[PDB]
Design a protein around this ligand. Structure first.
Ligand SMILES: *[C@@H]1O[C@H](CO)[C@@H](O[C@@H]2O[C@H](CO)[C@@H](O)[C@H](O)[C@H]2NC(C)=O)[C@H](O)[C@H]1NC(C)=O
Ligand SMILES: *[C@@H]1O[C@H](CO)[C@@H](O[C@@H]2O[C@H](CO)[C@@H](O)[C@H](O)[C@H]2NC(C)=O)[C@H](O)[C@H]1NC(C)=O
Ligand SMILES: *[C@@H]1O[C@H](CO)[C@@H](O[C@@H]2O[C@H](CO)[C@@H](O)[C@H](O)[C@H]2NC(C)=O)[C@H](O)[C@H]1NC(C)=O
Ligand SMILES: *[C@@H]1O[C@H](CO)[C@@H](O[C@@H]2O[C@H](CO)[C@@H](O)[C@H](O)[C@H]2NC(C)=O)[C@H](O)[C@H]1NC(C)=O
Ligand SMILES: *[C@@H]1O[C@H](CO)[C@@H](O)[C@H](O)[C@H]1NC(C)=O
Ligand SMILES: *[C@@H]1O[C@H](CO)[C@@H](O)[C@H](O)[C@H]1NC(C)=O
Ligand SMILES: *[C@@H]1O[C@H](CO)[C@@H](O)[C@H](O)[C@H]1NC(C)=O
Ligand SMILES: *[C@@H]1O[C@H](CO)[C@@H](O)[C@H](O)[C@H]1NC(C)=O
Ligand SMILES: *[C@@H]1O[C@H](CO)[C@@H](O)[C@H](O)[C@H]1NC(C)=O
Ligand SMILES: *[C@@H]1O[C@H](CO)[C@@H](O)[C@H](O)[C@H]1NC(C)=O
Ligand SMILES: *[C@@H]1O[C@H](CO)[C@@H](O)[C@H](O)[C@H]1NC(C)=O
Ligand SMILES: *[C@@H]1O[C@H](CO)[C@@H](O)[C@H](O)[C@H]1NC(C)=O
Ligand SMILES: *[C@@H]1O[C@H](CO)[C@@H](O)[C@H](O)[C@H]1NC(C)=O
Lengths: 380, 273, 370, 176, 49
């Protein structure tokens, strides 16, 4: 390793730093909340009718376990575009309170459903902010909801004063003033109704074939999680390096019973540099401290390879007792373990020394380790 | 009754859900500016024998949240109402708690009746309630019922001299309505003591409506130690009912070892600050 | 009635002297005095891991990092020369003698009193009272927090070896005069050494052998005053405390820099890898990594500049120890304000404190000369 | 100032700059140590003595001529001819342009204070020899001060008093 | 700011800000080096005086 890091075939006398060593995780745990209630996406989907865009609906889903896999059993999705989240990994996250906006609208303008898009849908009839983190789903609805005589349940706002803000509803039923002539009357020239019906003829082609559309605005914030994916909880493990997944907070470290009195509304135990120092178990209200694994640097003490071919190893800043636990088959970044617990492991204020014999004499410093400790190549 | 005073060090609350210990952390949120002035509104009960009007529920513009304080022994105020119109044309919200539970109902109310006031108003013998629930007449198509635990049960007062300060801060932001509460037991000598006490969060509710005005619901059936004075402007008196507004300011908070916000300093008040 | 008042400075008290073409003022009395001086010698030894700091044990971030180039190789190389330099500086300032002299069992140096600076055997650590004051005065879970890849290495020479060097120098300079810097040490009584040192600055020996008692009393009083002068004044050790503050604040800013989005969705790698697919998370990782690289580069550059600044003072301290202590200096205003006699090199955390002994004329009288 | 330089008082640029990090705070703290260092340099070079000596009203220093370096009270600013020549030789809408956020701070010691230190040092060294650096000033006439200085470099005293006129003439010629 | 909408102009601002940051950083580094160089000569002048 020293030859590799020096990029040479001959190393001189001295102490060299090569790499670091880290203890590796042994097992994994998963703890998801205490809920078994299914969420009713079928209510949004298997609906007799959809409210039109001019007054968009809104349903809140929370406090229920959800599985989007059953969503695949309903219909082929025309677009199914998830903007801020990976669609595949939607079953591994826990959220606060997802939303839902359902409506039937012509399928030739589906591209207008995006943050900062153009057209009437994105300007005068609806809008999404530049902070959308969710998904959009659509599927063909021309055949199911149409009329040979002309379906007129979809008068949509098309005139208004200024572009409506995202996540705001306007249901002002008034005759827009479209000219100089005063619009005090019911109707007339320069007094136009902003709402226009649709010619939902079943014989029309794909030019104006309406689709059903659902918009999910996932709520992502540091708050108690209500809706969650379909996973199974396990048993927590203490005093052992585990890959904990507490409510979706992936990490690695050892867990201990914490000693800080959380408040009832308190959830995390964050500290400087955005590290979740302490966290409370979702199943039973118990709090725990997270401590990172044992990590350190390694250095190779060698005489000149011209003279001999023996080396010693120094682990910087780790107690000697933790090394045998760290010593296993492929357990550290220096996967080699030839020394393991070898020749007279000696503990020094600088670190843990392997491969050297302490002596009760004194000479000049040949190769310096530190804290008043030096090493040398001597017989007996 | 119109009066002004100074809020020394009131209006500090936990910005979010997280634990910290012995940390001087800076935040930039909506807080009550330090050493600001708060208007005083007082109940007026004059000539209880006759039916002279009182009208102690004036409109308040509700500019970006409200801080409210009171020092009532009994639940003289039983709740609040919030709405841009407070009528059936738009949506309204009501928060009232009776002896058992609380009720929060964002609903389309045709019209809200006046707070319960009796013509006799015999506070000498009016220490009981009877038929004091018929409010807002009827309801309409509406949702989001939150019949749950009430806010205040009681803070028992013994030997007198123990007025219980109750402080509530209400804020509506990005579709959520949040209420933080704190009940300080000791009144000491001054009406508004100069101390430090954080406001632990109480409730967050996802309503998402339009609000530009609110009104207070008092138990006008019985009222004592609520006289009236004709002072208007920068005057003094007594209100037992304090309201103040919130501002987007930057604060620095000092979390002790136990995790309690012991002290805080403003960043736009004084050049020393 | 206290307030804030603004004014122009005063450039010292005005004074004038009478210059006459036949007149001369000659002193008649002298005064010994002791002055202190403080010099930083070395700072802390640090080390950094590039991959651990930049990426939290994620493999994809590691692949991107190695794809950019060999930047952190040289960023790790640069921080390695600094530690060797600090060890060399501490080696150079103190280890001037290759012997370890020892003070005699009976300590009577012709009436003088050195017990305030000699080693103290009663204390568990063989320090000296002034050294104890200096150690206690400087104030060194927060340290454990700085383990995000950052590490601090221990000094090669612990405080005990520094104390032994200091004691050896101080024993040699009071037993053998200044001859232990040239060749083999030659023993000599103290009063004769002090007579030589007066003769060095143009005052004959027939002064010391009369005013021995007075000089000894003045010397003892001055050393006695030094301890209270050091303790009472608040910012006397203001130069040995700036080093630790600069180190701590640099490391604090470096570790706090991780809580910055740099225009990305999140500030934690795991959340990004959990929320997004590889081909879209690549741009987020790429945008996140560059800010951390710049922070690390800034840190190492400031460390280099500060190390050079410290090395200048280390060389100056080595020169002063060579000249003022191991001999007598004729240079004006180098080893104290006044005519220079002796020096004593006490130790102190991350530095060294010199005690200079001087000689100032006291009582004057003017005559007419030709 | 970081924000004024980077952003033309725009709000969005301010938001982006603040979300980048603590870079410009560190730059501001970096450009502050240098100013204090400059002030300490100027204080350390000149402020060696804590007294302000003055020359006697009559100026006859054993034949030497110091009028070229001593302060001239006739001039509006109490400088000396050499100082005036040096000050005039160095040449300092250019300044007005450099106000896009940049600022130049003023020196802590004005030029008059520097001149006063210079005159104090120059008068003290002429009048009291070199004894005003060790302790109290001790007056001594100039000819025996120069006798001491020759005795320093291995030339005995009986050279100066004999060659005083020639030495003074050479001194004046060189200083001219 | 005036000719373009926010969501498109943000990337332009990000491109415009980094060059100015780098210019400022280079300036302060050069000032630091020159300050050290001047301090050396200041110490020499103090010694000579
Ligand atoms: C000593 O005294 C003063 C100066 O200390 C000098 O006397 C003046 O000398 C100049 C030049 O020779 C004459 O122009 C003045 O007229 C002298 N003064 C007076 C009052 O006459 C000179 O250096 C010495 N003078 C004596 C008398 O010893
Ligand atoms: C030089 O100064 C010293 C200190 O002021 C003088 O020593 C003092 O002498 C008086 C009278 O003999 C004593 O009462 C004091 O106790 C002495 N002081 C100390 C500290 O011992 C000394 O006398 C002065 N020189 C001359 C020639 O008078
Ligand atoms: C040298 O000076 C020290 C410092 O004062 C002397 O130590 C003091 O000795 C006296 C009497 O023995 C004690 O009352 C003091 O408490 C000691 N000082 C301290 C700080 O403990 C010492 O005696 C002096 N030695 C000689 C030979 O004069
Ligand atoms: C000292 O030197 C100055 C500088 O030259 C002399 O001043 C000159 O005096 C002569 C005759 O009075 C004038 O012609 C010159 O113009 C003067 N120089 C200047 C710059 O004005 C001064 O006389 C000399 N004094 C002594 C005592 O030697
Ligand atoms: C819910 O909590 C109870 C105890 O509070 C526990 O016995 C039960 O196993 C939990 N349910 C799940 C699914 O973990
Ligand atoms: C190894 O050492 C021997 C003797 O010390 C010397 O003769 C030889 O040249 C060396 N070889 C190398 C490759 O340095
Ligand atoms: C290493 O751990 C053991 C376990 O108790 C402990 O006794 C020892 O003191 C530790 N090492 C050091 C240097 O403290
Ligand atoms: C070496 O010295 C140490 C000092 O404490 C002692 O503990 C140890 O027993 C000694 N070893 C031998 C072999 O004498
Ligand atoms: C605030 O109230 C005070 C009285 O407490 C009054 O003097 C002042 O005019 C009010 N308005 C301010 C400070 O703007
Ligand atoms: C308080 O209000 C709740 C909510 O409707 C009601 O169920 C309860 O009966 C009320 N208690 C009374 C009126 O005493
Ligand atoms: C409430 O409606 C009014 C009417 O235009 C509007 O100005 C205001 O912005 C609305 N409230 C909110 C929070 O947008
Ligand atoms: C923290 O709370 C405990 C709980 O009893 C208390 O004993 C302790 O005094 C508190 N700490 C401080 C600094 O008040
Ligand atoms: C000594 O100097 C003083 C002023 O410092 C002066 O008054 C006195 O006359 C001088 N001595 C003689 C003998 O002139």
């Amino acid at each position: 390793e020293t030859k590799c890091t020096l990029k040479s075939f001959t190393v001189e006398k001295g102490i060299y730093q090569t790499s670091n060593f880290r203890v590796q995780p042994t097992e994994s745990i998963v703890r998801f909340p205490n809920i078994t209630n299914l969420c009713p996406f079928d209510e949004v989907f298997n609906a007799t009718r959809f409210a039109s865009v001019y007054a968009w609906n809104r349903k809140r889903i929370s406090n229920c376990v959800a599985d989007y896999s059953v969503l695949y059993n309903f219909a082929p999705f025309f677009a199914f575009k998830c903007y801020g989240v990976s669609p595949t990994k939607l079953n591994d996250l826990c959220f606060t309170n997802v939303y839902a906006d359902s409506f039937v609208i012509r399928g030739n303008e589906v591209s207008q459903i995006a943050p900062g898009q153009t057209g009437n849908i994105a300007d005068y009839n609806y809008k999404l902010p530049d902070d959308f983190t969710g998904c959009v789903i659509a599927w063909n609805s021309n055949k199911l909801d149409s009329k040979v005589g002309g379906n007129y349940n979809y008068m949509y706002r098309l005139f208004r004063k200024s572009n409506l803000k995202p996540f705001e509803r306007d249901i002002s039923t008034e005759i827009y003033q479209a000219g100089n002539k005063p619009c005090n009357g019911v109707a007339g020239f320069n007094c136009y109704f902003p709402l226009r019906s649709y010619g939902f003829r079943p014989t029309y082609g794909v030019g104006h074939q309406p689709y059903r559309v659902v918009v999910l605005s996932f709520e992502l914030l540091h708050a108690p999680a209500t809706v969650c994916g379909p996973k199974k909880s396990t048993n927590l493990v203490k005093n052992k390096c585990v890959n904990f997944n507490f409510n979706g907070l992936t990490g690695t470290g050892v867990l201990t019973e914490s000693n800080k009195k959380f408040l009832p509304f308190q959830q995390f135990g964050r500290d400087i540099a955005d590290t979740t120092d302490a966290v409370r178990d979702p199943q039973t209200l118990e709090i725990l401290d997270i401590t990172p694994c044992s990590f350190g640097g390694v250095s190779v003490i060698t005489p000149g390879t011209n003279t001999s071919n023996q080396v010693a190893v120094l682990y910087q800043g780790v107690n000697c007792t933790e090394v045998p636990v760290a010593i296993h088959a492929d357990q550290l970044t220096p996967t080699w373990r030839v020394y393991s617990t070898g020749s007279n492991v000696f503990q020094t204020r600088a670190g843990c020394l392997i491969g050297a014999e302490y002596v009760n004499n004194s000479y000049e410093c040949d190769i310096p380790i530190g804290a008043g400790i030096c090493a040398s190549y001597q017989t007996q | 009754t119109q009066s002004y005073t100074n809020s020394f060090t009131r209006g500090v609350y936990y910005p979010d859900k997280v634990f910290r210990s012995s940390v001087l952390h800076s935040t930039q949120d909506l807080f009550l500016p330090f050493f600001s002035n708060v208007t005083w509104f007082h109940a007026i009960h004059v000539s209880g024998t006759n039916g002279t009007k009182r009208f102690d529920n004036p409109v308040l513009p509700f500019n970006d949240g409200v801080y409210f304080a009171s020092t009532e022994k009994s639940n003289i105020i039983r709740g609040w109402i919030f709405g841009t119109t407070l009528d059936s044309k738009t949506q309204s919200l009501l928060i009232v708690n009776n002896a058992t539970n609380v009720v929060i109902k964002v609903c389309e109310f045709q019209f809200c009746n006046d707070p319960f006031l009796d013509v006799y108003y015999h506070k000498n013998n009016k220490s009981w309630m009877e038929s004091e629930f018929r409010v807002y007449s009827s309801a309409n198509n509406c949702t989001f019922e939150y019949v749950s635990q009430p806010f205040l049960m009681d803070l028992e007062g013994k030997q007198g001299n123990f007025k219980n300060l109750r402080e509530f801060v209400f804020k509506n932001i990005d579709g959520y309505f949040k209420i933080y509460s704190k009940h300080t037991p000791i009144n000491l000598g001054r009406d508004l003591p100069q101390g430090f006490s954080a406001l632990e969060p109480l409730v967050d509710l996802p309503i998402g409506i339009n609000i530009t005005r609110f009104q207070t619901l008092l138990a006008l059936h019985r009222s004592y130690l609520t006289p009236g004075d004709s002072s208007s402007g920068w005057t003094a008196g007594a209100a037992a009912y304090y309201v103040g507004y919130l501002q987007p300011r930057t604060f620095l908070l000092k979390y002790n070892e136990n995790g309690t916000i012991t002290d805080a300093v403003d960043c736009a008040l004084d050049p020393l600050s | 009635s206290q307030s804030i008042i603004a004014y122009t400075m005063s450039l010292g008290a005005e004074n004038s002297v009478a210059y006459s073409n036949n007149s001369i003022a000659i002193p008649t009395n002298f005064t010994i005095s002791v002055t202190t001086e403080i010099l930083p010698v070395s700072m802390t030894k640090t080390s950094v891991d590039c991959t651990m700091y930049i990426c939290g044990d994620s493999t994809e971030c590691s692949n991107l990092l190695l794809q950019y180039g060999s930047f952190c190789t040289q960023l790790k190389r640069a921080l390695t020369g600094i530690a060797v330099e600090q060890d060399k500086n501490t080696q150079e300032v103190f280890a001037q003698v290759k012997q370890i002299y020892k003070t005699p069992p009976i300590k009577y140096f012709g009436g003088f009193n050195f017990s305030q600076i000699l080693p103290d055997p009663s204390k568990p650590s063989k320090r000296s009272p002034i050294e104890d004051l200096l150690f206690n005065k400087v104030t060194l879970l927060i340290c454990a927090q700085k383990f995000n890849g950052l590490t601090v290495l221990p000094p090669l020479l612990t405080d005990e070896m520094i104390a032994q060097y200091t004691s050896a120098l101080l024993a040699g300079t009071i037993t053998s005069g200044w001859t232990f810097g040239a060749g083999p040490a030659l023993q000599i009584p103290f009063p004769m050494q002090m007579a030589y040192r007066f003769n060095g600055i143009g005052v004959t020996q027939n002064v010391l052998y009369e005013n021995q008692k007075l000089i000894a009393n003045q010397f003892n009083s001055a050393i006695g005053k030094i301890q209270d002068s050091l303790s009472s004044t608040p910012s006397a050790l203001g130069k040995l405390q700036d080093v630790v503050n600069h180190n701590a604040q640099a490391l604090n800013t470096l570790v706090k820099q991780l809580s910055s989005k740099f225009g990305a969705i999140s500030s934690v790698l795991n959340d990004i890898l959990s929320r997004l697919d590889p081909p879209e998370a690549e741009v987020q990782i790429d945008r996140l990594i560059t800010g951390r690289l710049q922070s690390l580069q800034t840190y190492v550059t400031q460390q280099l500049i500060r190390a050079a600044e410290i090395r200048a003072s280390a060389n100056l301290a080595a020169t002063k120890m060579s000249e003022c202590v191991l001999g007598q200096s004729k240079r004006v205003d180098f080893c104290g304000k006044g005519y220079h006699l002796m020096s004593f090199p006490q130790s102190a955390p991350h530095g060294v404190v010199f005690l200079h002994v001087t000689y100032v004329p006291a009582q004057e009288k003017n005559f007419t000369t030709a």
